[model samples]
Target: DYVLYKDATKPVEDRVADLLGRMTLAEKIGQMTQIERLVATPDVLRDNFIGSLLSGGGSVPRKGATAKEWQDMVDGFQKACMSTRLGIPMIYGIDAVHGQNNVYGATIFPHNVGLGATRDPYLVKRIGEATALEVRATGIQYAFAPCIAVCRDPRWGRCYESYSEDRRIVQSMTELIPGLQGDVPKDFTSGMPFVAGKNKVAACAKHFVGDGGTVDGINENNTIINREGLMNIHMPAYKNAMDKGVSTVMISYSSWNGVKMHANQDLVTGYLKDTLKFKGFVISDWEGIDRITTPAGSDYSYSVKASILAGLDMIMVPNKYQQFISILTGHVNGGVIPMSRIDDAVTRILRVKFTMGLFENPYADPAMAEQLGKQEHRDLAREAARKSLVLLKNGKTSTDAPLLPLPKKAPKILVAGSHADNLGYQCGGWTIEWQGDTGRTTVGTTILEAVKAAVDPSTVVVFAENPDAEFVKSGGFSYAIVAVGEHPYTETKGDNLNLTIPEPGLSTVQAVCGGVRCATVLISGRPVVVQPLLAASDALVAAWLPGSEGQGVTDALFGDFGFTGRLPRTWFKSVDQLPMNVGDAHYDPLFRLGYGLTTNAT
Candidate 1:
């Protein structure tokens, strides 16, 4: 007999209700579990009735996997899901946080910190659109992106993931949600889930509630803010995300007060669902439940009960699905976890699948595989890179005259620093590999090449990882472009109390600028102590992790594109200004938020 759930023409709610009613308890539980791709097989997917799969950063089919390989991998998994009696398609997810970063050869855009400098929602929206296309090219339909964290401290390693330290800036960047999922439906209200077309994919607003405000900028550390502070700061972006009709929300690993956020019912259910009226499904972070206890995974059974009972719909589970399913099944059977909660979670997951058109069109489109690194997307990335660059200093004195718009036809020029010609360093963490490795990890033009391309064919360009004063004087170069910044890192590994430009970089700066007139570009995720560098240079630019497109850096440096970006976070004068923000009692900053200079370039 034909089933109502199998009919694509029926209303989404009808399809969801009919399918949910037909599911066994085992099937329902499977819908709530998402596993990593490495441990997953087609047989495993079919046997477990698993509903989702994800490639955590750096997780891929193989080294340098092509778009077709990525498509084949996911399509294979979908075919396995189809083998099941109910044939529910599993939603595949990846952290396409900055472009389709997990896949090699895909265009990598600047991280959120740089995007925030642009302060242009329209540009951010276009990035979302480009990112969605690239993501779909790899056969994935969901992106864990536009982190939406209102980072309160620069010390947090994930601060690069946040759009800004200000809630309003974070709110404005929520345009990215609609860009990924298509604009909200005209007939639909704002606080509802949505994904409009095949080209688009579901977007997730993540690490909900105070992840960015942790004490001492600790990763996944407890946030001790009062309820008022929470609602005012960390809570606003989520409201904005819901208004944009985001399809999913990922719970943070961080805790609220002394309690783990994974087990906070008042906020997760009472506030997010009942009060704020979020209609999307809530997914957990990687091994999010395990951390609820003293030692992660110490009490898996208790962790599962607490997180699920608290209102999490999808458990990343990642690995050890058998244990998760067994424990959860026991809880439901023993009456520790109510059947009502299971139904609620399953229904939300199915609703999103239906809304995404996954029931009717489950397989990846081979036609879109070519869209992975399209030149159009790279052009957009270049535009974003140019706009993301904030000119922090242009000459020592106001009347000294701007040193940028460096003559494109200069007879000789010097480009120096460790990052000057490194693609991996430019892309930063979450590129082709997790904890992103340096040195030509992927295909992209470096600043050195872009400089050569910008200058006249006859002009010569000298390169040095660390140019000494002698080389600078010997070359008698017209000017030097000193590129320096932090190496790639993610999460707690990136956290640092004392932020400064790394070795050879500092010495390189002094040598290049002190020897000859030059401009310096600081490629970093956040502001660093650059008082000394500023004093030595004629100009400075904050190129916060500009990805793939080094040509954009040259565009701004050569006056082809004017510097339009502003500092999204306060550029502190010293490390003692710990936790200091825009509106502190004793606020002192090297460069205040919204501070940026302009150039008259046609």
Candidate 2:
């Protein structure tokens, strides 16, 4: 009772003040450091009084670890963190980008691109709610997610992460912030952090400022926009995130005009913290500050100083913790980074930890462990998949008879393409691995599996990943479902100039559609050129990486569910007219934004 900071009954600000007042410089600097899980041993965290730990892409306890494994691993570190002299609880974070994806058997929802096609804010919020429960199940307190980038060009590798190219769609999706952090109560103040209870995890609105408007859609490249363009296009989603009480913001790896976002004080501090009054902490992306200088990590001394001065609250030192601690210690001692700034950053960090109830309840809740990949969440993903399918072409022409609601009783049917039976391709990036993988990487139904389950038992189905025209022509099938598109990729690896459907997918589309009546389902992260391949197909569907629950595809195809998804990005005629979007000068697209064909449930 004597230690004011230990009392849960005290007001959050008072507890934050009491905690800060009791902390020494080493404790304060320790709170500002966040290292990767690989380097965060119990002794390492306890001795340094490290504030946070993060599991980067592909960072796991073992290959395909279970939720229980993740909990034990994190709790081991937490126990050490709690054993410290100050006994302040440390927070753990991960890129829970699409569901609690890192842990195997977690209910993997469709990526943001699929959700964008749904254009349903309520659905996204519900996804966030489930994501929080799953994230908390693993004993993690924070998630780096809801990347609100308004992608201006589909060429960007991370465009799938953006909800839409349109700012309005992105803004509406801010409902996810509340879903992650729980709805702020009536007494909740705007701009202040809010996490209702242990069931919820703190949300991060990421890569602050213009990460999506990079020139030519290059990853981590500079944005060449003026203030007017920036305010109108990429900045609105963050404003929405703030209004919804997002607990944290992640600084981008990209630069604005010429300066790196990591060191851009005018935007990070002057605009985000001061002007927008974002009371929560700001964080850097993986090795974000190290890349501030040309030939990254060249000027570590300046990188540490500039990023801190620019108002970054936590440095994801991810590695080499002592070097950063030493550099920051010198800065504090030499007055390079002001004491008030240090306090301000620590205060923000402590406020989030306190507000989220990390001190009172810092470990995983076993009740949530069962929620991972439960039938209910999988059912939700199935519903999400159903709503996100965009029926771009139901028939060859306006006057043509509808080809969908495919008869499940047909004697014979053909399923063709690499993605048809593959879970990794269907899930896209951010699945089990960083770049994602193939062939049942985790638990969930594949399209072929869902197809077999949905159709009449008497019906015979033929499966081929890359069937030739002869096979398709000789199959004697009632109708063929051609599923093909981009393979799993993340970040720069996903970047492409042409933006056309890759390899076997293009050839498979040509082969199958040429032989018989075909419903071509293009599975991709963004719109690839489909015009040239459009004429041969009887019908077309934009199945944008519908993760895990592939039965949703069959649900729409069989007319059990109606098609409701709309175009989140304008479908380009070709890559020649790159960067073209709705409202652009001389705008022309194969399918304009908001375009989608409707289907009625039988």
Candidate 3:
């Protein structure tokens, strides 16, 4: 009887009767609450009765905590939770958005925007499986991942976080859910244990409804789409996720019209719970309820009432845990919030805990952590990275010749630009930190290193972090490779009214292309305003956040591997023609989704 629920036909009351009969109130409430590791230590977990904990982006155990240290920290907390009366272990979560990119040495994969361009969901799923292994290696369960937001505008700071503008692509990638849950395929055996079955951590299909379709693509802004538009555009992938056995859902910070999603019970409780029939608990985003008061200056009391009543099972009380617990309890006692609502929330939380098997086994195993950041994990990332590259423009004409596979034996070669030699730059946002670092933040081979390693050992590789005309002239290079793109950017800061490549990147492109007959590779999270740069370069490659295995990029460029990446997102011809799609009112792009040309050996 390993079935998640003992009886499918049993009423909610009967199931509650069976479950609640075996638990204390503290145990019930512990299942309802979710705290952060920094806030809830072993002492805090036992004393305050915390249900779950998470390592928010950049919140590691100790200063410079290693992979083993992280696993140990998580294990210690789980052991503490087990000491409680009921001994129900706590669920820990992390934003493993791109191949567990937060952990040092973990194989960083292409950002969702890049993966979208590949139009390969199976590859995305395999990447998910790889990410899950690394996550489980750290003894943590539950990844806040596979962000299935159908991002409509490139201006959104989280555009890189989304899979595609088209919902169908995101839907296809729901393969990630099953892949994360189900056992690895027979042919894919490796050192790591594949994440499968009930013990496999649950996946959260996040930002619930209308996060990606926000007006002007502003972060946490109102999504003004009409009812039909909402269902047609943003609702497909979520439905797909549910069908694939997605165990949890995170509520969006955005709202429809002027109504905040934190307070909007109709959509949350009525539509998602009743209509969609989602059995999983809805967890609130970090301090999302506080933003209820437009300026978000509301006191904690108002937020506690609105959020709990609006169907939030677990509040991500990132910092103020004591204050939140007090306010919520006070509200329940004063009849402002009913005990029934509290019961409902706790019930939902417990159900997910039981289904996820946190009740049976909840401690981190260090042996698992030792396997983290392995070379094989990077190889999995390498395959996904190779497939995610989009050949925006191979060459002008049929006889113009492909730009990749730069002559291996060229006497002198030039590699110029700030991004060319930097590992952090190539990794993009969400690498080692929250808004990933700029210089060498972690151990990874940079694009420059990979290129030199791939080419002839004696083929003098001349590199300039930011080369002047003198450096280019001094090299007397036969060919050059210019690496240029956006800097470390994320969230609201990434939004641009005009999606243009910044002046520095554009200038670098112009300077390098002006000097030599070079092929340019643009390393950016999303499509930049590339119309101007298109004319200057003889060849262009959209290298979207290809992680640690820089050799993958070089492999494609040097004829070792064939170029197979297709566009997952449309490349616009101009900024004026925004929001173009396959079945649009009028459709056009510089390069359409699924548009990548194949090139033979040079």
Candidate 1, residues 1-602: lDDT per residue as tens digits?
98999998999889999999999989999999999999999888999999999999899999899999999999999999999989999999999998999898999999999999999999999999999999999999999977998888888999899989888999999999999999987687656789986799999999988999999889999899999999989999999898889999999999889889999999899988888788779999999999999989999999999999999999999999999999999999999999999999998899899998998889989999989989999999999999999999898897887898787888889999999999999999899988877988876899999998889887899998897898898887999999988999999888989988788787899999988888898988888888988888899899999999999999999989888999999999998787888888888999999999988674
- Return the TM-score for candidate 1, rounded to 2 decimals: 0.99
| lDDT of candidate model 2 versus the reference | 0.90
* Cand. 3 Cα-lDDT: 0.76
Q: Could you give candidate 3's per-residue lDDT for residues 1-602 as a string of tens digits?
A: 34223454554445545666666545555666788887877888987678889888778765456778877888888888888765667888898888777787777888888788777888887877777778887778888877888888777888888888888888898788766666435663221122344336678888888899888888899899888988988988887776666777888898888788888898888887777777778888888888877567367788888988888888888778888877887787788888678777877776666655565567766667655777887887777777777766766567976666677888889887777888888888888787877877776778788878877766888887666666676677888888888887778778777787655776776777777777788888787788767777777788888877777777677777677887777777766776565667777787777788666545
Alpha-carbon local distance difference test for all models: 0.91, 0.90, 0.76
Q: Candidate 1, overall lDDT?
A: 0.91
Off-target runs (Cα >4 Å) in candidate 2 are none
lDDT by residue (tens digit), candidate 2, 1-602: 59989999999899999999999999999999999989888889988999999999889999877778888988888999899888888889999988988789888898888899898999999999988988887878899989999888889999999989999999998888998899988876667888888999999998898888998899999999899999999898888887788899999999999889999999999999988889999999888999999999998999999999999999999999999999999999998899999999999999999999999998888777887888888888999999999999888877988999788899999999888999989999988899989889999999889989999989999898898999888989899898988888899998899887778787888899888888888889999888756776898899998998999999999899889999999998888898898999989898999999988888
Ten-residue region with minimum lDDT total, candidate 1: 184-193
Ranking by TM-score: 1, 2, 3
Q: What's the C-alpha lDDT at position 76 in model 2? A: 89
Better of 2 and 3 by TM-score: 2
- Give the candidates in order of lDDT, highest first: 1, 2, 3
Query: Better model by lDDT, 2 or 3?
Result: 2
